[PDB]
């Protein structure tokens, strides 16, 4: 869910205040997302967006209804290293890898200025 998203990046980026820093940035951070990314920091929000559509396509989340934004996973941050529990089921643990992968990405890429609070026209 959010709240583990959040802290991931935090985990990552102790720096950061990932709410108001990620969220309405580029074409795909943040709510939607369509349109060619502008950056490799937009990349990032996009491979996100695309690893939550694929969550909705697993076997073991459909059968457990599963919302990849409430979904309930653990994991722990160690030396801003992230971790996802062993004891995540399936769906849980594919989750918490879209997370993971989307953290360490913002993590690897310039985060440009002039992308954030994109108006979604140039999308
Ligand atoms: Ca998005």
């Not at 369509?34 to 490799?40: A, F, I, L, M, N």
């Not at 992230?82 to 913002?106: K, L, Q, V, Y």
Request: some cysteine; glycine content about 4%; proline content about 4%.
């Amino acid at each position: 869910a959010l709240w583990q998203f959040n802290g991931m990046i935090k985990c990552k980026i102790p720096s950061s205040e990932p709410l108001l820093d990620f969220n309405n940035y580029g074409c795909y951070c943040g709510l939607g997302g369509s349109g060619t990314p502008v950056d490799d920091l937009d990349r990032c929000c996009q491979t996100h967006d695309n690893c939550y559509k694929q969550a909705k396509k697993l076997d073991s989340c459909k059968v457990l209804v599963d919302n990849p934004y409430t979904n309930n996973y653990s994991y722990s941050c160690s030396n801003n290293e992230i971790t996802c529990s062993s004891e995540n089921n399936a769906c849980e643990a594919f989750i918490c890898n879209c997370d993971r992968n989307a953290a360490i990405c913002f993590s690897k890429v310039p985060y440009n200025k002039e992308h954030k609070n994109l108006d979604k026209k140039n999308c």
